[PDB]
Symmetry: C4
Subunit: 231 residues, 4 copies
């Protein structure tokens, strides 16, 4: 099974993630009177990964996330060499979603990706609820780590075969349930990028945080499972 | 196992889809103060398919959708010959639901299938939130394609056996979470028809869109898996 | 494995159903500002059965419902002789829940099981949203039938082993999503009884409907699978 | 597989439970206009356990709860000797979450763990909706018992392998759906402690209830399965 497809799967996967989990935020979360709120976005998030982990996890591993791929290298599950391909696939996928989405969102008067934020991840004054950078750090580091704690745990050799996608996608929804008000929900650098580019302002100015923190978090989780819990 | 049953399963299946996913919209989505909103409709949608994919997927394949059957032909999974039977079963099932439903909905004064829309799919002025035909196209084409990307992926030879219905039904709920405000949620020509007939106005005038777009989308997904990702 | 336990399982199971799915309605559905609405009740409903189907389905079959047991006899899955034991277990279980619940509900001033309805199932003037008896009939008959269509389908010899409880519990939540505004959600005579006794008024006066309709519905579903779809 | 890890798994597990299920309450449940309400907290709760039962249940058994560990001893599933280690791991894990959380929550002006309650469990005047201590007892005893009824049932020798985490985590969400308005939702002494320490007032004054009741409940469930239903 040639590597062009893994990339293709990681690519489509991450697009699907950014199309659904950001679409929901942008189009449905706030819709007058019948909108899906944070709950529904958190759910949507999980489901993109549930669904695509099932659809192509059996191909690429089903990461859809730079922090996952990296954090998976840290846990000794993924090879050094293949990491850079995934992270690019992942990022490029996300961008294409952010555009098609951006274009879609544009068909309804009122739309302003700048003003509105375009589901871009922020901290401090750009925390959906005004949380400090410190809160943002703790929440993203704790939740990134746990995410990969859950990924490694669920894909453990001894862990019941197949359920992994439920275990993970749901994790993400849980993470969403928790973290939307602090970071607008991230733990996925490809995702913060995809829409940061289109918000094109502060979202681009803080974007680094949402590479650095979740990646380190992903390493911290990978090492917490690999050393402490595994073997 | 004779073909009359596959049709019977596809028939009951699609009815169950249109009864639940449209019922929820019509009866519960907007109910004063405790109603289930778009979230709950999106969920209901997914669940009809989750439940009936489990209940009879083991018989017909469990399509419940003309775009699925067609898009499945495109991925080389379904036979040319059997496609027309499914699409009819699918459509006829849906209609019977739309009526029983229509009759049910009628037992509560106020009811006006014309005025209200009867959960019919629309774009532009009939987009639940006023989206352009272009937005409607992009959203339906992207989401139809992905749907079959997920169906083919989940039913892949190498993909863990049995989980498919969770993988798909949830996908649909996700699609619902995303697309209710743009198209009132479709990717299923049988479904747009079932209630278009009873709305009997603009819903019938735009119905074509919701055959053409999701079908092409289903082909595009079928070909994206079959050529790029499968083998 | 002696029969006293099947009854014990069906008994605890149905209690758990009536404790959770009616508790949610009575205590949480309407709670000021953060309450769980119909959505959350519908979910709770499904989950009682998901959870207890897993917990003891492997013992009794996991019916928790007179209409299920009967409708299962109709599909040729359950033995004639054992049906009466289940239905009693089922009913007695539910009552004990309705009381403990009733007692629990009583600890908060304001409480009036008469005034409020106590989650009792009704039609017409006692339809949560004023639906006609006809609408109530169609909705309960369609949804009872489908429920057992899904139960028989999911527990089919050829259907993937184990997933059944997800398939069913979710069905029920879906049914809840649909039918709360028409019947306050039933398809379970034991359940309508359990709280009808405590509402002690119109709920007792209409209770028959919620034996007759869902039972016939359960037969209609049992026969629809057994004759048409099975073999 | 050395015991330091079981403890480590139970430790991380319970932290993840208290981070997610209490985070959601504290940060998202009430968020203006798009917050996740009781529904979303109930969900979050379930999901922590779903996810971590999958991630490390295959290591420690995956209790994350003193009442579970104890109640599991009562059902003859867990060894006498190992119980005290789990309960400590469990408690220590939770505390670390409550702090990191507490610190996180602090980054948003307004925050007052005293005033607000900090998701601490209470009864009577500290019942989120003013329920009597009696209601609180019945609800916690019924729901603790059932929880372990479901745990023992789901992990039964004859019960389908692997699904257990869905069966349990969902149970908990169901319990949340039901019991948030009566106790602010507990059945987990480690959890009531974790945030009682930080609320540092009445939450510490009633904390005992949320050790005594759910533990006894867990025994009552363990014995109800072991004697009546198992064998
Ligand atoms: C190719 C994927 C990574 C792109 C990241 C965008 C670069 C971040 O840098 C940003 O560049 C913008 C100019 O384009 C400016 O508007 C921002 O102020 C600047 O900070
Ligand atoms: C594979 C391409 C993605 C790499 C990650 C890009 C991280 C962007 O980092 C951004 O750089 C801006 C330019 O100065 C700074 O102004 C911002 O503070 C920072 O958010
Ligand atoms: C994936 C991108 C990683 C970025 C390099 C890590 C170094 C962190 O450097 C950070 O860069 C910010 C923006 O340039 C500055 O404003 C911060 O003050 C600084 O801490
Ligand atoms: C048999 C299933 C397909 C039926 C599609 C309905 C035909 C669409 O065409 C419609 O016919 C109606 C008259 O019945 C008119 O009200 C509409 O304006 C017209 O566009
Ligand atoms: C198997 C039967 C279903 C076939 C698909 C029917 C597509 C209906 O197409 C409809 O036709 C109307 C009649 O002119 C047009 O006015 C509408 O623009 C169009 O929505
Ligand atoms: C399943 C039904 C497919 C319809 C045939 C595809 C041709 C698309 O033709 C469309 O038909 C519409 C309604 O008649 C016209 O109003 C549009 O302008 C036209 O683009
Ligand atoms: C034992 C389980 C079935 C009990 C059903 C209750 C009987 C229904 O009958 C009811 O009896 C009540 C007197 O108790 C009256 O209040 C009602 O008006 C009457 O209709
Ligand atoms: C195993 C015991 C449960 C049997 C089902 C009880 C059905 C109750 O039936 C009730 O009877 C009342 C008494 O006249 C009538 O007034 C009500 O119309 C009717 O709802
Ligand atoms: C499980 C209980 C089944 C009841 C017997 C079925 C006969 C239906 O009989 C019904 O009884 C009602 C109440 O007594 C009457 O008010 C109705 O008019 C009548 O149709
Ligand atoms: C080590 C884990 C268990 C700690 C439980 C806290 C002790 C409960 O006791 C509490 O102690 C506090 C002083 O610290 C006081 O504020 C409370 O009024 C008192 O009741
Ligand atoms: C392993 C450590 C956890 C043990 C459980 C601690 C139970 C705390 O119990 C608390 O004690 C307080 C001190 O008097 C009392 O005032 C409170 O009424 C009571 O809630
Ligand atoms: C895990 C902690 C268990 C506590 C010991 C069980 C004895 C119950 O004792 C209780 O203690 C309360 C607080 O001290 C008193 O206020 C109550 O009146 C008393 O019933």
């Amino acid at each position: 099974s040639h590597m062009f497809r893994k990339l293709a799967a990681e690519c489509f996967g991450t697009f699907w993630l950014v199309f659904g989990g950001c679409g929901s935020a942008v189009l449905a979360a706030g819709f007058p009177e019948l909108g899906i709120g944070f709950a529904g976005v958190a759910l949507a998030w999980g489901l993109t990964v549930l669904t695509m982990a099932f659809a192509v996890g059996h191909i690429s591993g089903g990461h859809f996330n730079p922090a996952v791929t990296i954090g998976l290298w840290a846990g000794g599950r993924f090879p050094a060499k293949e990491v850079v391909g995934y992270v690019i696939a992942q990022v490029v996928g996300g961008i294409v979603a952010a555009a098609l989405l951006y274009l879609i969102a544009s068909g309804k008067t009122g739309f302003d990706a700048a003003a509105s934020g375009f589901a871009s991840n922020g901290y401090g004054e750009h925390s959906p609820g005004g949380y400090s950078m410190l809160s943002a750090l703790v929440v993203e580091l704790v939740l990134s780590a746990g995410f990969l704690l859950v990924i490694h745990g669920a894909t453990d050799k001894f862990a019941p075969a197949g359920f992994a996608p439920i275990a993970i996608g749901l994790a993400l929804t849980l993470i969403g349930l928790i973290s939307i008000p602090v970071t607008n929900f991230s733990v996925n650098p490809a995702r913060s990028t995809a829409v940061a580019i289109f918000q094109g302002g502060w979202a681009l100015e803080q974007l680094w945080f949402f590479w650095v923190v979740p990646i380190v978090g992903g390493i911290i989780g990978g090492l917490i499972y690999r050393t402490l819990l595994e073997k």
